[PDB]
């Protein structure tokens, strides 16, 4: 079959279609018009956007397709080097860091992180408990305070103290500016245009701000007398079984930056979206709050209790279905091959998995794909393979998946235990794109249930 | 046909990701020779560097003026004025016939007193500098040349020497022309990220048109009788058609002449003084002519015509750094260039003038040396070897105006001052479509010869 393709603009081809600050949402609309697959071309770019489970289950076959670095990830390489997210599977530092750092996401590691997650989550509840009458909550800002501080403490034994600051942490501001440049730069067909020197300088300035924090974390660890076994301990001391080598200092810096970014941004979005969907669906909020009150019988949650919050987990997965906060990943053909029986591909041909569209495949989920109902995830073993991919695929899947879901389940159930929530502005969903997704401007009011906390 | 390194679908575009594209193109020409193809998104052209091929491109029966991408962008500023119009556009020939008498010998003799007025202001500024002070040469050459076209062409005094900084028209003009130049490298121009460039470009065009408005209103209100460029724009009838230029085109012509009428002449004067201070033996010979010929307190028209060596200095400065360094042509029909490059109707050529002017088969092996004596016998220079003022019916209409102004001013500078290259200035050629030696500074020591 001949592959659908959206409107072309001469030698720019499809490039002008993404002259917007919401490209992923723009691509979802093209997918609605063109269907399960369409080609997308720009100067120096050929890729194919996949939106059906039928085709994406083939693309998730690791014997036939490997992870590709999209243009966006290549630009992010200037920030995160050959860290785990922005390295090729064949680069020696991917496999090496993967084996060195995977033990930091074992069950025993998670049980060790729990108390530190509780530390930050209690700070969030306390902030909201202490608001005055008619004050409201800026939800993404506060979810970012929590998730950045959580990965800082759990991964690096470092306190960013984001809740002690009225404005976003400086690292956040520079990160957003850097990643925003990475998103914008995709539309620069000729990025070495002399006029781009200022963006490049600002880009380097922001990377410097982020590396200044990395420098502080490393100096802090070197000076500390505390016995840790967190991520940073493994980065500094773990040896790859295959090679017997540790990560060198250059790659450690890249991993720190990688985990400071990847370990909070998408989790902040998820929590923001989850709370958005709850206040838009009060019957779901009430059901999730009932589970929280029944399970969380202690002043602070235990690890075991968080594992029993089944419905909250369903809520989080259904929020990831509708708005997966890392909404696409890229693949390339390892060999000449035919996709879906209809689309011949040459070795090196690139695919984009458009996760929000996948997650709206009506052949999988039914006709009501736009509706928010966690009950879809009652029986997870019934969901077809590769229908639900908010955490990527295969050996290049998200290494932090269980970290994120444990954190988000913990925090959301504690929010639901301790407060009633009002959508006092009748907020209109506005999804900001900075590679990742978030509900910009989302605000709520919280009314405390006056249930006390502990340690 | 030779072609430089390509970059996928961007073709040759990334080779001109520089502030100095013409100088980059000269280096490609050094490597690839008399002709190379250059492609970009929406662009195919062929850069010519040899007199052998350029003499054919200058055959008006085979090739007509083309609007390069740069000139198409300048069209947003100067519309269908004489520089940015197509030859077959009605307003080109109509305006050409109506304004050509403004550049006759009769008209030049009338401009002379007004050129001397501005030249005298230049000299008196430098006479009045304190010992610790120096000259910013291009800035003062731009003060002079803009005021000269304003006064001679439009009977309007911009009074650039009464301003410590560049004239606002200049600042906006440069910024607008810099946008036009940079847009050649801007492949996705309708990205919203470009909105600010568009806003600024519109703002700078408005500043330039604000000056136009003031000139037009000044003439309307004037009780003095002028017979200058503006008189012919407003009242000249096209003999071939009996009709005058319309108001829209007149505005484009005023903008055109305010820009074209000064910017390249400012650069020429700047380069000429640069080469003189770098070649003191030539400076001495030129200064000796000025002192021998300019026997009066201010130069006369006749005296300027006797400044033969100063004229040779200016031509040699135009040889090495022609301040409008390229022009474009297209094939009127299918044809063969140089016996081996078939062209189809509409194919474009670029004449890379600085490389033409370094053709060793014309000028000899010492093409980089500054030697005005090259032009001692102008008739012995082959046709189409020396093309600083363009070609054919689309050649510079202001050529004699520019050379009279620069000869007058340079000879007065040399008559009245000794010059010192006190910083040992390193040539840095800024490109804004046109060329100038950016940052060129000197100290001037007066000879204390009174003015008139
Ligand atoms: C809801 C929260 C999260 C979502 C939706 C998410 C999503 C994803 C996705 C889609 C990928 C695959 C990228 C690709 O194929 O190009 C990925 C990879 C990755 N994620 Fe996450 N992530 C989340 C949380 C986290 C957390 C909390 C961490 C760290 C603690 C983390 C660290 C990583 C790393 C290191 C990789 C690259 C792994 C590798 O390729 O070896 N992520 N994530
Ligand atoms: C050294 C100083 C100057 C140089 C090097 C120069 C150079 C040139 C060149 C190369 C062209 C041809 C452009 C093309 O083919 O696309 C041209 C055209 C033109 N120049 Fe000049 N010029 C100078 C001074 C002036 C002055 C003083 C004026 C006005 C008083 C002027 C007005 C024009 C006009 C109106 C045209 C377009 C003529 C037409 O096509 O009908 N120039 N000039
Ligand atoms: Cl571009
Ligand atoms: Cl440690
Ligand atoms: Cl909803
Ligand atoms: Cl998987
Ligand atoms: Cl795999
Ligand atoms: Cl926000
Ligand atoms: Cl016409
Ligand atoms: Cl020299
Ligand atoms: Cl010398
Ligand atoms: Cl001609
Ligand atoms: Cl300068």
Residue numbers in the entry:
A (entry chain A): 3 to 457
B (entry chain B): 5 to 456
Give sentences from the paper.
The crystal structure of the M11 mutant of the heme domain of CYP BM3 in complex with DTT was determined and refined at a resolution of 2.16 Å. Our crystal structure shows that DTT binds in an orientation allowing a sulfur atom to come in proximity of the heme iron and it represents the first CYP BM3 mutant M11 structure in complex with a ligand as well as the first CYP structure with a hexa-coordinated Fe atom with a mercapto-containing ligand occupying the axial position. In contrast to our previous crystallographic study, the observed electron densities in the active sites close to the heme iron in all four chains in our current structure reveal the presence of DTT. The Fe–SDTT distance is 2.32 Å in the A chain, which suggests ligand coordination as it is comparable to the interaction observed on the other side of the heme group, where the Fe–SCys400 distance is 2.31 Å. Direct hydrogen bonding interactions between the DTT molecules and active site residues or water molecules are not observed. In all four chains DTT has been modelled in a similar conformation and orientation but the electron density is not sufficiently well-defined to identify the precise positions of all DTT atoms, which may indicate ligand flexibility. As found by Capoferri et al., a DTT molecule is observed to form a disulfide bridge between the Cys198 residues in chain A and B. Due to the unobserved loop regions in chain C and D, this disulfide bridge is not found here. From a comparison with the Soret maxima reported by Sono et al. in their studies on binding of sulfur-containing compounds to P450cam, this confirms the possibility of heme iron coordination by DTT as observed in our crystal structure and it indicates that DTT coordinates in its anionic form to Fe. Our crystal structure indicates that binding of a DTT ligand to M11 does not significantly alter the protein conformation, which underlines the use of the structure of this promiscuous enzyme for modeling purposes. Docking and molecular dynamics simulations also suggest that the monovalent DTT anion can adopt a heme iron-coordinating binding pose, in which no specific interactions between DTT and the active-site residues are observed.
CYP BM3 from Bacillus megaterium (CYP102A1) is characterized by high turnover, and by mutation of the natural variant it has been transformed to a biotechnologically important enzyme capable of regio- and/or stereoselective synthesis of a variety of organic compounds, including human drug metabolites. One mutant, the M11 mutant with mutations R47L/E64G/F81I/F87V/E143G/L188Q/Y198C/E267V/ H285Y/G415S has shown to be highly active and able to metabolize a diverse set of drug compounds. In biocatalyst design the M11 mutant has served as template of further BM3 variants. To analyze the possible effect of ligand binding to the promiscuous BM3 M11 variant, we present here the crystal structure of the M11 mutant of CYP BM3 in complex with dithiothreitol (DTT).
